Structure formats: structure tokens, C-alpha cells
Amino acid sequence: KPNPLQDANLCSRVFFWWLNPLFKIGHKRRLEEDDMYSVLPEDRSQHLGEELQGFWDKEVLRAENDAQKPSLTRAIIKCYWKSYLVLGIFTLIEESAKVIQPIFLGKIINYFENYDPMDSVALNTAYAYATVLTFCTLILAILHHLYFYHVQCAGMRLRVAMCHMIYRKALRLSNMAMGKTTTGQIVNLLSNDVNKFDQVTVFLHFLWAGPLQAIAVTALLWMEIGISCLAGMAVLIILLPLQSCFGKLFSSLRSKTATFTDARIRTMNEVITGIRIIKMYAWEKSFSNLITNLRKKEISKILRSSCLRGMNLASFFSASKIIVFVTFTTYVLLGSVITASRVFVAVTLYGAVRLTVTLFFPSAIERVSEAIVSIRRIQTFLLLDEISQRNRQLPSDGKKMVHVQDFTAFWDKASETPTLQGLSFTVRPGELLAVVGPVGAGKSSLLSAVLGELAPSHGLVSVHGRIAYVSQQPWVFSGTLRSNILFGKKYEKERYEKVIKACALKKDLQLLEDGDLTVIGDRGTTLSGGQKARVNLARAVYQDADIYLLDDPLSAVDAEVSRHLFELCICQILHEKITILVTHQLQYLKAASQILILKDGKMVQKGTYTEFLKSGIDFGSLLKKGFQAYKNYFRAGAHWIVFIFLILLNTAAQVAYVLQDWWLSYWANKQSMLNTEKLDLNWYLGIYSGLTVATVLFGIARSLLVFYVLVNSSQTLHNKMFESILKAPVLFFDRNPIGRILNRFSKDIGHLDDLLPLTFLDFIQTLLQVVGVVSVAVAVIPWIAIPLVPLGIIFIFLRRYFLETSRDVKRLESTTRSPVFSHLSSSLQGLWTIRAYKAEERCQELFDAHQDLHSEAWFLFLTTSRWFAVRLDAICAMFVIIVAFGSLILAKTLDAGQVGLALSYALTLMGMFQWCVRQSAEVENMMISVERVIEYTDLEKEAPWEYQKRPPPAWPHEGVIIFDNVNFMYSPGGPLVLKHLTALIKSQEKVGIVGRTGAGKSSLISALFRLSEPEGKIWIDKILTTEIGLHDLRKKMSIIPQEPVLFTGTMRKNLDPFNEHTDEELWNALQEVQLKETIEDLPGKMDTELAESGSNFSVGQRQLVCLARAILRKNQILIIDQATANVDPRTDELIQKKIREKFAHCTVLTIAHRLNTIIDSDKIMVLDSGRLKEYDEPYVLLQNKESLFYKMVQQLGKAEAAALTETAKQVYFKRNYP
């Protein structure tokens, strides 16, 4: 991958010519890492990191010498100033040209108003001034982009060096430092804060260019016009504190609305998660009411924020007109006269100085402040303590011995109890030493202390040679499994075969698709704990070390793999090297050569297994303690009348803005065509003031109207799509994951609320300004129309060409920015294992490779943007030059003011055109959010909540249930879960459900509740179920679900959301719940707000609340879903006794995984994969030995079978023969 920047002439380099092959490839097909362009060797991360290491270490040596604090800022400056000053020189000369251009404009105009048809020397001077103006425009619009690239490349180099520094420091930090900090912040700053370096460098050079430019412009204007320069500069400067005040107010309002935004996101996540339960309880009306209220409360604040944003933007639009109006009002009232030169000189100078002062200086100052904060945080992290080096790399002469004497170490020095006390043990190669103790006694602490990560407070420790160690928690860095096993060591086929046959990993190889080359992501999401432990053991054994340390490696695996691993990896292999192992399994201690008992940090007994057996101490005892999107989006706002009014207001404001300078030109022309008689100042000043105030008012009104319409459209879209999704069937929510359905609630709507209105308004404003300037340029000289068509077609083709390649780069960089973060996270998580081996330069090298790839993506992203910018500026400069030369060529018929207006607007098209193009690209890129929202607008709807045929309020009188050829089906074109159910359910009877967790169980509940449209005929009290509205059906059929889930809020709403009960009834029912005393201790008597899903409550309390809601809704027909899964037997017997003592007159359908709760049931469905097999009394069912219910009973055993038979028979005799 050669870098063409190596072979690039300066003429080609300035024009960015070398990117032509890459852009041709991007047009032909897509982009990928293969098409990537390798970075310059100087741009590599390793060299920058080495330089920054040298400089930072030098300054910290200086700081230690001088007895003072260090300075990352000082190090960075002393590293980069010598190579950053030349770009400052270049920006100085560029700004000199930028400020000298209007003087040449004034000279050319000065030629115009003194026209002489027969003169030639004046025309030659005019051409000379025009061509030096061409030089000025070309140098402003050509070399500026190369300077910008070099500035941003210096910033990128700085960011890369800082990242390499922070990773290198993180990989070599101490245990106390890790305890103080966390893996979250340490990746958070590297992901967010360091990115300020790629933005601060861009505006940095304007700190020393702003005031100098302002002073130069002020001096020029003081020379040109007179006293009005002070007034103009004062008005322009007063804008800045106003900008700061609006920024502060907007930030405060955004912080105020953030809490409402977070509350809405949290509650909508909650309803999405608990959507099956909320659908089965028919509280979606209350939830929709709450969401609507919160949405209105949020929309008020965001409407205020949008209004403030629009006011700020309109004030920006009218600032230049206000400044020039004040300046010229002072100019005329002082007693001076108006010509056609000074007018446009002042206008252009104001444009330039206003742009610099308002758009660059404050952004530069705030980015510098943010970068200083970033450097302060980075140095705060960097000055953290470091692990003391041990025995350098390897000076020892092998010394294959391990010894520990009088060892007492502290995990923390502040604690009073040493973790381990007075360790004394030595081990030799070929010894199978082991340690056994209670969980948490410090065996892992002993292992780590041997690893050297624990500072020896007392005694001596001597371990020599490279060490292989396995952590208790499995760790695998993301990548190919072969790479994880190899650890970076060279590949040996026979060794890999021996390891793979010894570790019994062939099963994992054949299970995984790629086998040995399978890709594993973060935290081993593609594998299991046992597989990860086996992988770690395989890596350790392949390392082929001398001292082996294992921390409970066989705990999270089965017996066969554990015995195979232990035997055929130690008993015939590790009997020659140093082996220290800790196990919670006592079976393997027979083969252990040495065994130690450790508890309370002190040794108890060390010896052989037979010696411990003779001692009589029990180890076990010790172990136990497009366009249509635009059309719909704009229609959702308001009717087209408001749209045409808005476009008319846009046109009126733009025409007034142009007419202000046109009136200046007309005033200059009329003054020139004179002669004493004096022009009536009142008329012209009044018309000028009227035009200026019209511009300001129309801009304000336009911005407010645009924001109002867009915000109203967003609100209407959100309401419509939420109302649509709330009525969506459960199939949509089963198919779409929770994260996917919440993404368009938390992100797309957010963008539609706070970014699309402003961005669209800014784009339309810039487009109107550009089209107005071009219209002026055409109107002044009608002949400029001819080149305009080729210019436009060339621009359109260029935009398409650049956009067909920019998207690929912008997505490739985003994709490539994640692996560095993943690598940092995984390496930090496995830091103990990483430092156990001497190998860390390899980890540094892979980090360097990932950083190089990310920097390569950044480099291409920079170069493509610079190429597009230079092409656009070339076109704009061509326009400027053609306007100027046409004006000079046809000067015999024009006049000074008209020419000046034309050429000044041609001058100011610079930057405006670029901003318009960039904002158009951003808008067409980000429209995808409302595309997703409108896609969510029209999900399919279920049956209407209320039918025309309203059921009688008294139904059900009895509760007879009829199943007639009932077939349930999860989705169309899917398996038939239920097959022709035919049964009758009488009034006030108890029905059980048997079988297995493969018969459907919940399928019947889904059919009755109609989560999905079923097939067949079901009659409830001689009424066909399909003819009852969903709210008129589910409201009168209660259920206690799989997992009870309480909802965020108070108990009052969380029990009776629709509020048809009384406080006395609430307290009474809660008293029979027996949680009344449990709840009458909270800060609120009954209004205490609960945590998420009752985190402070127990599952039994959840079940009690559910049965409370059931008894309060007191419908005849109820269903219970596996009331006990892992609940304590006390709360179990409570819930069964309540359910059997409160529902004597209520029909109940019971489903459960255990027969004891349903052995007393009068009747039972026998279900098998949706097929009804038997239906009779349970004792009659078990009377037949061939019955499947009897087989299920006999599966458990005999004594429980006998008890169930006794209970069923006594129920049968008591009921049938009273």
C-alpha cells in the first residue's frame, strides 16, 4: 500500500491532484480497508509516542529537580512549537491578503466613477488592479486548504501521541490505582476527551490573528470613511457579550429540559420492557395519558429553546445590516457625502471583520479552554502511581527455585488485619504443590502475591524465570481463537495438535463455524465460561513455562472434561515443572504431592494426602463456613397555506436584504449625478431605515415561524407514531428487540426535535443568500448568464462525484474507531494475566496497529474533504474573476455603485457557498431519522378496542368456557402450536394444566387474551369471543403472570391506575394481603414512590400485589401462571392458601410446572404440543396406568406419587361423596 504523498510535486500537492485514482475507485465501487492508503512513516503512532515519552520524561525530571508540579502543557508546547510556528506565518500572510483585498476593490471602483471613454492608461491600471485582485482571491481560495490540512494533521499527530501515551500508562498502573479509578472512566476519557485535540488545533492560530485583524481593519476604515468606524466597531463588539448571554441561557434551558427528556426515556423503556403485562392489564390508556402529559411538558421547554435558537440565528443574519446602517447613518449625519467607493469598501470590511470576530474568536477561545481542561484531566490520570519494577527483565542465572519466608503483605496499608500472615514455603520443579482453604481466605491473594503484584511488607520472596499464570475469572481478548491460544508466540503445528488433543477442545472446534479461527468479540459473547477457562488453560500449557499458577480453573466445568484435563495435562506432563494449584474440588487432592491448609491468612498444616488423612481433619467440613419523506414531513407540520406563506416571507426577507445595498447604490448614483443644491437627506435616510427595520423584522418572523412549524411537525409525528405503536400486535415487539425499538424513541425523535429545525433553517437561509447574490450578479450584467449553466452543471456533477465516495469513508472511520476502545477494555480487564507474562510489547504493538488504522481513516477523511473544498473554492473564485472582468469589459455602459454592489457580493460569495453545500450534505445525511420515524408511523393495528356490539355489563354471569377446534398460531406461515382443542369449562370450577414445558401452556392464555388472532370458535357464556372488544374482554378476565412486575410510581397508581376504588377498600384488601404492616412504615402512607420493578421488594411481595389487584378487580374468571418458581416455601404456602380461600366462587385456570399445587384440582387439561389427550378428574386419570398424567406422576418417584395419589383420592371422595 504505497503512499502517493511520497511522490507528489508541490503543484500537485496544493491542488490535491493525487486523490484522483481513489475517487475513481470510489465512484466505480464501494470502499474497504483493502482500498485504504497507508500513512506516512512519520505519522506512525510508535514514533510520536517515543518522542512524547522522551519530552514528558525530560520535563518531569526537570520538575523533580526544581521541586514543583509538572506540566503536560509545557511538554506539548516544547514539543510542537518549532514545527507549528511556520503555519502561523502562512496564516498571517493569508490574512494580510484577506484584509488587503477591499482596498483593491476601492481602487477599481475609484477607476469606475471617474470614467473617461477615450482614455487608455486608466483602463490599463484598472486591468492591473483586477488581475492583482485575481491573485488575492486565488491565494485566499487555493493555498488556504493546504494550510488547513497541515493544521489538522498536526492536531491528528498530537491526538495519536496522547492516545499512545495514555494506553502505555494504563497498561502499567498499580492495584491501588485500579481500585481508586475504574475501567469505565479510563476508556471514557480516551473515547471522548482526547478528541478535543482534533478541534482545538483548527482555530488555535486565530488567537493571535483576531485582534491584529481587527486593528488593521479599524485602521483602514479610520483612513477611509472617518469617525463612523468607531460606531461600527462598537456595534459589532457589543454582539459578543450578547452571544455569550444567549449561549448561557440556552445551556441553562437545555439542562432544565434534560430531566424531562430522561424521565420520558426511562418510562417509555419501562413500558416497552413490560409490554406483555401492560397489554394484559389494559392500563395502556393510563400509560398513554402519562406519556402525553410528559411529552407536553417537554415540548413547552423545547419550544422555548427553539425560539431562542431562532432569535439568535436571525440576529446573526441581521447583524451586518444593522452595523452598516448605524455606520452610514453616522456618516451622513456628520455632514459628509456618499460616493460609490467608500460605501462598498466599508461593507466588505465589515463583512470580513464580523465573520472573523464572531465565527472564529469565541469558538477558538472555548475550544482552547476545553483542550486545557482535557490536558488537565489527562495529566491527572498520568501522574498516577506505577508498579515498582522487579528484577529488571532477566539478570538471574535461571535459579529454578521458588521460596517465600516470613511473608506478610497488605492489600491496603490502612487495614488492621493483614490478608496473609507469615507465609513460609518453598517449591522445586517436579513438585505438585497445592493449597486448600475456605473461600475468600486469600488463596487467590497468595497466588497474586507470588505473581509479585502484592507489595511484600515483611519477609522475602524469591521466584525466578518467566511465569505462566491463569486468573480465576476467564479472560480472552477479542480476535481469532487461534491468536488467543498462540498469545503472539510463533506457531508450531505439532505443539498445537498436542495442546488441542490434551485440552479436549475439538468439541469446541467442531461446534464453532470457523473452528480454530473463530472470531470472538468483547467479554466472550460468542462462547461460554467453561470454554473460556479451557482456552485459558490451553494458552497456559502452550506457553510451556516452568512455574504454573492456577486459580480455580476446574470450578465452572463438568466432571469428564475436568478429569481428562487434570490427568492428561498434569499427571503425565506437569510432574517435571513447578506447579502451584488451588482447587475447591477435593477429589484431585489424592494425586497432589503437597497440600497446604490456609485460613485467616495463616498456614494450618502442610503435608501429603495420607498425612492429612491420618490427621483426621475433614476438608469438606473446612470448606463450609427521497422526496416523499420531505413531503410527508412538511405536511405533518401544517396545511400548505402556511408553507406558501413561509416561502413568501423567505423571499421578502431576502429581497429586502438585497434592496438595502441596492438603495445604497442608488443613493451613490444620484449623489454622483449632481452639480449649491443639496440632496434631500430625509427621504433617503428614512427609506434606508425602513429597509433595515424591514430586514430585521422579517428575519425574526421568518426564523420564529420556521422553528414553530418544524417543532409542531415533530410533535405531531411523535404523537401519531406513539399512538400507532401502542396498538401494535405483540408479534412486532417479539420480532424487534428492545434496543432497536428504543433507539428510534431516544435518538431519532431527539434529532427531529433539536437538530433538524435549526439545520434546515440555516441551510435554507444560506441558500437564499447565495441565490440572492447570484441574482444580483446576473442582474447587474445580463451576459453572465451564459457561463452560469456550465458552472451549475459542473457543480452538480462534482457534488454527486464527491458524495458517492465521502459516505464510504465517513462510515469506514466510524467502524474502525471501535476496535481500539475494545482492545483497551479487554487488555485492561486481563491486566493481571498480561503482566504475569513478561510480554507486553506485543500488546503495545497491536495497539499501535489499531491506532495506525484509525489514523489512516482520519487521514483519508481529511484529504477528501480538502479536495472537495478546493474544488468549490476554485469554482467560486472563477465566478469572482469572471464578474470582475466582465464589469471592466462592459464598463462603458455601467455605473460605479451598481458595479461595486455586484463585485462586493461576488466577493462575499466566498465561504457562504461552502457553508451552504456543507449544510445541504448534513441535512440530506441526517434526514434518515425522520425516515425511520415515518416508517414507524404506520405499523399494523390490532382489532379496535371498542366494537359496535357492546357486551352486557353483567356478563359473565357464570363463566362457561367453550373450546371448539381451537388452533393457535404465533405468526402467519408458522407452526401450528395448538391443534383442535375441544372442551367445556363449567361455572365455579378449578382446572389444572399438566404435561411439560413443550406443550404450549401459555398458548392457551395468549389465545384467550388474543395476543394474536387465533383460529377456531371459542364461546364464553354463549358469546363468541371474536365479537367482544379487547378492552371489553381483557378487563373482565384476570391473570397473575409469569414474573410479577410492579411499575414505577406510587402504590395507588401501580394497583388501581384507573382509580375506581376507595382508600378503605385499598387498605382492607392490602390487609388480607398481610403486607399492610409491611407498607405502613414508608415515608409516605400510601404515596411512596417505588424503585424499578420493585427492586426494594421481593418476588413474593410482587405476587401478593398481583393477587391484590386480582381480588380488587374481582372478575369471575382468573388465570394463574406458575405462581411458584424459586420463591420461599413460606410465601408459597401463603399464596396458595390465599388463592384457595379467597376464590371459592371464582373460576380459575391454573398452569404450573409442579403437580402438588394442582393435585387437588377438580379437572385438568392434558396437553401435549397443543393436542388435548385426556380430560377427567386427576384421580380417575391416574387410575389408568396407561394415562400420560400417571406417567408424569411416576416420573418424579414413588413416595411423592403416593402422596399425590392420596391427596387426589381424598379430594375425590370428599367432593363426589360428601
Residue 915 contact, options ligand URF, Mg ion, ligand ATP, none, Cβ 5-8 Å cut-off depending on partner type: ligand URF
User: Was 800 annotated as part of a binding site?
Assistant: no
**Rounded Cα distance, 32 and 808, in Å:** 8
Cα-based distances in Å from 851 to 38, 202, 371, 798, 856 = 12, 21, 21, 32, 8
**In the complex, residue closest to ligand URF by CB:** 911
Please state the closest distance from residue 1018 (CB atom) to ligand ATP, in A: 18
386, burial (CB in 10 Å: exposed 0-12, middle 13-18, buried 19+)? exposed
Residue 552 contact, options ligand ATP, Mg ion, ligand URF, none, Cβ 5-8 Å cut-off depending on partner type: ligand ATP
Q: Please pick, from the candidates 911, 951, 1029, 1049, the single residue that binds ligand URF as defined by CB under 6 A.
A: 911
Reading the block at residue 1093, the C-alpha cell is 420493578
User: Was 440 annotated as part of a binding site?
Assistant: yes
Q: Interface residues with ligand ATP (CB under 6 A)?
A: 175, 411, 419, 437, 439-445, 472, 551-552, 582, 734, 970, 977, 997-1003
907 binds ligand URF (CB under 6 A): no
Please state the closest distance from residue 200 (CB atom) to ligand URF, in A: 16
**Rounded Cα distance, 120 and 116, in Å:** 9
Task: Name 461's bridge partners.
Answer: 404
Q: Which residues contact 610 (CB under 8 A, 6 or more apart)?
A: none
User: Was 1100 annotated as part of a binding site?
Assistant: no
Please state the closest distance from residue 827 (CB atom) to Mg ion, in A: 22
Residue 474 contact, options ligand ATP, Mg ion, ligand URF, none, Cβ 5-8 Å cut-off depending on partner type: none
User: Was 1099 annotated as part of a binding site?
Assistant: no
Please state the closest distance from residue 1007 (CB atom) to ligand ATP, in A: 11
Reading the block at residue 970, the C-alpha cell is 404465533
Task: Name 1118's bridge partners.
Answer: 1038, 1148
Of the two residues 273 and 444, which places its CB atom closer to Mg ion in the complex? Answer: 444
Binding mask 172-211 for ligand URF (x = CB under 6 A): ----------------------------------------
Of the two residues 359 and 1099, which places its CB atom closer to ligand URF in the complex? Answer: 359
| Candidates 12-20, 201-209, 595-603, 907-915; binding stretch for ligand URF (CB under 6 A) | 907-915
Helices (H), 727-781: 730-735, 738-743, 749-754, 756-780
User: Was 437 annotated as part of a binding site?
Assistant: yes
Of the two residues 429 and 911, which places its CB atom closer to ligand URF in the complex? Answer: 911
Of the two residues 105 and 554, which places its CB atom closer to ligand ATP in the complex? Answer: 554
Pairing of strands 420-427, 402-409: antiparallel
Of the two residues 916 and 994, which places its CB atom closer to ligand URF in the complex? Answer: 916
921 binds ligand URF (CB under 6 A): no
- Per DSSP, the three-state class of 585 is coil
Residue of 1060, 1057, 1166 whose CA lies nearest to 1105: 1057
Residue of 555, 591, 551 whose CA lies nearest to 453: 551
Residue 734 contact, options ligand ATP, ligand URF, Mg ion, none, Cβ 5-8 Å cut-off depending on partner type: ligand ATP
Of the two residues 112 and 1009, which places its CB atom closer to ligand ATP in the complex? Answer: 1009
Of the two residues 46 and 199, which places its CB atom closer to ligand URF in the complex? Answer: 199
Q: How far apart are the first and last CA of the chain?
A: 93
User: Was 553 annotated as part of a binding site?
Assistant: no
Pairing of strands 1015-1020, 961-967: antiparallel
Q: What is the CA radius of gyration of the chain?
A: 40
User: Was 439 annotated as part of a binding site?
Assistant: yes
Of the two residues 562 and 919, which places its CB atom closer to ligand URF in the complex? Answer: 919
Binding mask 1004-1043 for ligand URF (x = CB under 6 A): ----------------------------------------
The residues in 1038-1077 that bind ligand URF, with binding defined as CB under 6 A, are none
Other CB atoms within 10 A of residue 249 CB = 14
Residue 359 contact, options Mg ion, ligand URF, ligand ATP, none, Cβ 5-8 Å cut-off depending on partner type: ligand URF
Helices (H), 142-204: 143-171, 175-180, 183-192, 197-204
User: Was 540 annotated as part of a binding site?
Assistant: no
What is the distance of C-alpha 979 from the center of its chain? Answer: 46
Of the two residues 302 and 1155, which places its CB atom closer to ligand ATP in the complex? Answer: 1155
User: Was 997 annotated as part of a binding site?
Assistant: yes
Residue 911 contact, options Mg ion, ligand URF, ligand ATP, none, Cβ 5-8 Å cut-off depending on partner type: ligand URF
**Rounded Cα distance, 318 and 328, in Å:** 15
User: Was 990 annotated as part of a binding site?
Assistant: no
Reading the block at residue 485, the C-alpha cell is 491460544
**Rounded Cα distance, 1070 and 1107, in Å:** 10
Q: Please pick, from the candidates 359, 649, 731, 1188, the single residue that binds ligand URF as defined by CB under 6 A.
A: 359
Please state the closest distance from residue 555 (CB atom) to ligand ATP, in A: 9
Please state the closest distance from residue 213 (CB atom) to ligand URF, in A: 15
What is the distance of C-alpha 970 from the center of its chain? Answer: 34
3-state secondary structure 93-112: HHHHHHHHHHHHHHHHHHHH
Of the two residues 213 and 1150, which places its CB atom closer to ligand ATP in the complex? Answer: 1150
Of the two residues 210 and 729, which places its CB atom closer to ligand ATP in the complex? Answer: 729
Of the two residues 349 and 978, which places its CB atom closer to ligand ATP in the complex? Answer: 978
Residue 441 contact, options Mg ion, ligand ATP, ligand URF, none, Cβ 5-8 Å cut-off depending on partner type: ligand ATP
**In the complex, residue closest to Mg ion by CB:** 444
Residue type, 84: Y
Please state the closest distance from residue 754 (CB atom) to ligand URF, in A: 19
915 binds ligand URF (CB under 6 A): yes
Q: Interface residues with Mg ion (CB under 5 A)?
A: 444
Phi, psi of 459 (to 5 degrees): 80, -170
Of the two residues 861 and 970, which places its CB atom closer to Mg ion in the complex? Answer: 970
Cis peptide before 956 (omega within 30 of 0): yes
Rounded (10°) angle between helices 342-359 and 640-672: 140
912 binds ligand URF (CB under 6 A): yes
1200 near 1206, Cβ under 8 Å?
no
- Per DSSP, the three-state class of 983 is strand
115 binds ligand URF (CB under 6 A): no
Please state the closest distance from residue 318 (CB atom) to ligand URF, in A: 15
User: Was 1035 annotated as part of a binding site?
Assistant: no
Residue 669 contact, options ligand ATP, ligand URF, Mg ion, none, Cβ 5-8 Å cut-off depending on partner type: none
Q: Which residues contact 581 (CB under 8 A, 6 or more apart)?
A: 432, 433, 434, 435, 548, 549, 550, 592
| Candidates 289-297, 700-708, 909-917, 1061-1069; binding stretch for ligand URF (CB under 6 A) | 909-917
User: Was 443 annotated as part of a binding site?
Assistant: yes
Task: Name 1168's bridge partners.
Answer: 1171
Residues in the chain: 1218
Of the two residues 607 and 911, which places its CB atom closer to ligand URF in the complex? Answer: 911
Reading the block at residue 21, the C-alpha cell is 485514482
Please state the closest distance from residue 1112 (CB atom) to ligand ATP, in A: 25
Cα-based distances in Å from 553 to 473, 542, 558, 794, 1145 = 9, 16, 11, 68, 58
Residue of 40, 41, 42, 19 whose CA lies nearest to 31: 19
Reading the block at residue 1204, the C-alpha cell is 399425590
Residue 912 contact, options Mg ion, ligand ATP, ligand URF, none, Cβ 5-8 Å cut-off depending on partner type: ligand URF
If you search the block for the grid coordinates 437538530, which residue do you land on? 755
Q: Which residues are annotated as a binding site for ATP?
A: 437-444, 995-1002
Q: Which residues are annotated as a binding site?
A: 437-444, 995-1002
Residues that bind ligand URF (CB under 6 A): 359, 911-912, 915
